[PDB]
């Protein structure tokens, strides 16, 4: 069963003494009016421990005499054995050998220190395992919890399980700002949650409890980006690689063709994915960054050589053919691709058009049989050489969505906002769009030629309209500059959304200035 922990979980954040001060500490706490799960032991399954738990109980017999923390409870994760024998709050942080069900009725650390409420707030900050308490015989009251004991265990705990030999609660503490109220004697007489209701963060900003009738800029409103829009022009300007690999005739071994590739986009991902290409060896480049980065001065060398000469064209290779045919540079950057072509470039009668140079001064026919080896079969070789502009891969291309705060990225520029259909016309060479402030104000997407603006996300202030706390507790919430469709009775005005209050067609001399015309009252 679930119940309402109204104002429970308000302890002393420090042993510092303070007198009659409204001190605001951003300490992890059980939120006001949170959801606290009442348990009944009639079993006791494992219970959560996020940032400590606001424990509580109402027993006239002291039936709870056991805590078991930790994760494994097999003498591996550091568990605890807190027990209360009605004479002293003895705390055992050592390891006991628990079986399937720990027995009711080698240790590391041992320590000793119906008409009753037994609250047992925990904490774990800086390895300082605090154990609070308060016994005030869940009502609509308020009782601060003093730091009964503290334990410098310095271990990580995230799960616990209350154990006994029938009403044991649990809590959830979250990093909530929290405004305290000390009396003269230095104890906590009242408290205020911070993110509970608009009046709560009003009290947070004012750092008081008796708020006056007025409007307070407690925070600012912001619309976060929803998704990402990355767009690049059409891939229709593909590189003419289809006619290069499918050419009927290829050049000779001594007349290898070199071609420049530019002003086009090529999908190398499929090129290195499928391997109808027998050899694919890359040096000086990372295939991981091939799709994410592009190179400059890309050159393609295409020729046909026999199979066994593929590995000879490589750095650190010595031989007659390698030295007298083609020398690769020490800092060669690119990929070497070679594939079989015996199905299309071979004839039974044999081709005598291939000739080789026998003698050379200084550095810069074939027997076709069914049983001949692969190395004697002709192989087409294409080598792509890269140097570390105008030619790059498609990278990423996402669709366009408008009328919603997104993260648009046109051609490689950042910026988040909401895109609007426009009418103003550009010049064909012009892409950007700016006002006097030199900030982007319009754009043409790289794929089509339609002109769409860029207007910032619907941000602004968010103020709380309240009467005095002595007058009322329900409040209005202004939203500054933002229309009232982004964010009770909604109401739109030039000031913005005013969730909470009611439009009135009448008009009186107003008391709480809203903005841009409206006033609120009670």
């Amino acid at each position, epitope marked *: 069963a679930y119940t309402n922990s109204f104002t429970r979980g308000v302890y002393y954040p420090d042993k510092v003494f303070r007198s009659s001060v409204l001190h605001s500490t951003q300490d992890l706490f059980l939120p006001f009016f949170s959801n606290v799960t009442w348990f009944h032991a009639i079993d006791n399954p494992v219970l959560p421990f996020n940032d400590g738990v606001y424990f509580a109980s109402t027993e006239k017999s002291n039936i709870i005499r056991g805590w078991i923390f930790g994760t494994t409870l097999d003498s591996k994760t550091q568990s605890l054995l807190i027990v209360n024998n009605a004479t002293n709050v003895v705390i055992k942080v050592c390891e006991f050998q628990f079986c399937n069900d720990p027995f009711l009725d080698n240790c590391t650390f041992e320590y000793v220190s119906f008409k009753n409420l037994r609250e047992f707030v925990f904490k774990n900050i800086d390895g300082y395992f605090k154990i609070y308490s308060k016994h005030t015989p869940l009502p609509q009251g308020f009782s601060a919890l003093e730091p009964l004991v503290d334990l410098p265990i310095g271990i990580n705990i995230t799960r616990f399980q209350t154990l006994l030999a029938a009403a044991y609660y649990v809590g959830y503490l979250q990093p909530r700002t929290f405004l305290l109220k000390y009396n003269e004697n230095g104890t906590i007489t009242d408290a205020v949650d911070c993110a509970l209701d608009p009046l709560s963060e009003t009290k947070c900003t004012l750092k008081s409890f008796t708020v006056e009738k007025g409007i307070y800029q407690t925070s600012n409103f912001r619309v976060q980006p929803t998704e990402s829009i990355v767009r690049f022009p059409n891939i229709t300007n593909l590189c003419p690689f289809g006619e290069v690999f499918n050419a009927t005739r290829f050049a000779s071994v001594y007349a290898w063709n070199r071609k420049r590739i530019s002003n086009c986009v090529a999908d190398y991902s499929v090129l290195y994915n499928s391997a*109808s290409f027998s050899t694919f060896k890359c040096y000086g480049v990372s295939p*991981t960054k091939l799709n994410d980065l592009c190179f400059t001065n890309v050159y393609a060398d295409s020729f046909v050589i026999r199979g066994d000469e*593929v590995r*000879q064209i490589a750095p650190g290779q010595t031989g007659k053919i390698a030295d007298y045919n083609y020398k690769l540079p020490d800092d060669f950057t690119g990929c070497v691709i070679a594939w079989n072509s015996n199905n299309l470039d071979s004839k039974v009668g044999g081709n005598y058009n291939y000739r080789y140079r026998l003698f050379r001064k200084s550095n810069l026919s074939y027997g076709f049989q069914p049983t001949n080896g692969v*190395g004697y079969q002709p192989y087409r070789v294409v080598v792509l050489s890269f140097e570390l502009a105008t030619v790059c891969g498609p990278k990423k291309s996402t669709n366009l969505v408008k009328n919603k705060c997104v993260n648009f990225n046109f051609n490689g520029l950042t910026g988040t906002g909401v895109l609007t259909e426009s009418n103003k016309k550009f010049l064909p060479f012009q892409q950007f769009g700016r006002d006097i402030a030199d900030t982007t104000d319009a754009v043409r997407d790289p794929q089509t030629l339609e002109i769409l603006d860029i207007t910032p996300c619907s941000f602004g202030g968010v103020s709380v309209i309240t009467p005095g706390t002595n007058t009322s507790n329900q409040v209005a919430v202004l939203y500054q500059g933002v229309n009232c469709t982004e964010v009770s009775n909604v109401f739109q005005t030039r000031a913005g959304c005013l969730i909470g209050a009611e439009h009135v067609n009448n008009s009186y001399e107003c008391d709480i200035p809203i903005g841009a015309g409206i006033c609120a009252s009670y």
Partner: antibody
Amino acid sequence: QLVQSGAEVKKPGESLRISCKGSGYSFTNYWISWVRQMPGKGLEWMGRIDPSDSYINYSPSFQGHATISADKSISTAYLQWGSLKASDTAMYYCARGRNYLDSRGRFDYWGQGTLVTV
Amino acid sequence: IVMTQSPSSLSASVGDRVTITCQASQDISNYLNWYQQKSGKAPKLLIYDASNLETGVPSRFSGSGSGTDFTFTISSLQPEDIATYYCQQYD
């Protein structure tokens, strides 16, 4: 011919080992290349191991998923995986590389059979 | 090296689920094929790597199986899928 193992008759969840044994020559004196192929497109090349000097040329696309190990006690090359998953469906080639006296690399012999399943 | 496919024959209505199996012998790693081949033409081979997914491959085609058998399920017969599916032996 290079001798390997054939298909499956066994239940899932069992650990198993393969081999690539050559005859008529010293297995440790010849380069062995492992090439990965499986249903749908061409090959992938991850690298080769030379047990004489432990020189490994790792392909950049390889991300340290398949550990490379050698057994010098039996002078046999075995391939093992540190962590197996359901998504490990791959087949591995084993072929004889260039001769020790030859400085030119070639692939003259290919495998004889390993049709593969777990 | 012997290959068998099961079931030998089956009867079903249009659009019914079709499941076929392919069997094996010995001790091995993990990778095996399926091909789409006509009566006397070259086989066809759609998805690749069984652990990588090819872009442009329709998601309606999938493969499974562990230990011995491989299960290929045809959710809906298509006019362009009228052929015999072969698990093919090579090395």
